[PDB]
Amino acid sequence: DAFVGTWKLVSSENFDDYMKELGVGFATRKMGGMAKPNCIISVNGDVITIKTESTLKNTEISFILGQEFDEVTADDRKVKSTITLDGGVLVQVQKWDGKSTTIKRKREDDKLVVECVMKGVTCTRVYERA
């Protein structure tokens, strides 16, 4: 849809703090911080796929809006994830060990803006079309 495409990371703010609040250790944070991923979003019928590709780490999720699914995150959390579309924003929550984090994806001008929240930390990542 508005989201379909191949997107390249162009800016990131507070990602290290976000990962630290998730409990990610130094080595994985190091990898994550200097990753410049592509994000490839596609849709086929009810099923949306989001691939995140980078030199040292790839991930992929496929889901139906509103249907919880199991996910292994890039930092190796085993979470229960649910993604919904609200006012044009793809809102993902991940739940594990009584914690949650939200990842909101929205389209703004030429950007795919990703806002990641864990407790008091807010990270903003901006992707542009490849």
18 is in an annotated binding site: no
Q: How far is the CB of 58 from ligand MQF (least distance, A)?
A: 7
To ligand MQF, the closest distance from the beta carbon of 73 in angstroms equals 5
Residues 6+ apart with CB under 8 A from 24: 32, 75
Question: Where does this chain bind ligand MQF (CB under 6 A)?
Answer: 19, 22, 24, 32, 35, 37, 39, 52, 54, 57, 59, 73-75, 103, 114, 116, 125
Shortest approach of ligand MQF to residue 63 CB, angstroms? 13
**Does 10 count as an annotated binding residue?**
no
Q: Quick one: 76 or 109, whose CB is closer to ligand MQF? A: 76
- Please report how close the Cβ of residue 85 comes to ligand MQF at its closest, in angstroms: 16
Does 127 appear as a known binding residue? yes
d(CA 82, CA 11): 26
DSSP state of 68: -
Q: Choose between 67 and 102: whose C-beta lies nearer to ligand MQF.
A: 102
Phi/psi at 13 (5° precision): -125, 130
DSSP 46: T
Please state the φ and ψ torsions of residue 21, each to the nearest 5 degrees.
-65, -30
Task: Compute the distance between CA of residue 5 and CA of residue 41 in angstroms, rounded to an integer.
Answer: 5
Separation between Cα atoms, residue 66 and residue 75, nearest integer Å: 24
Instruction: Tell me whether residue 66 or residue 71 sits nearer to ligand MQF (CB atom).
Output: 71
Binding residues for a fatty acid are: 125-127
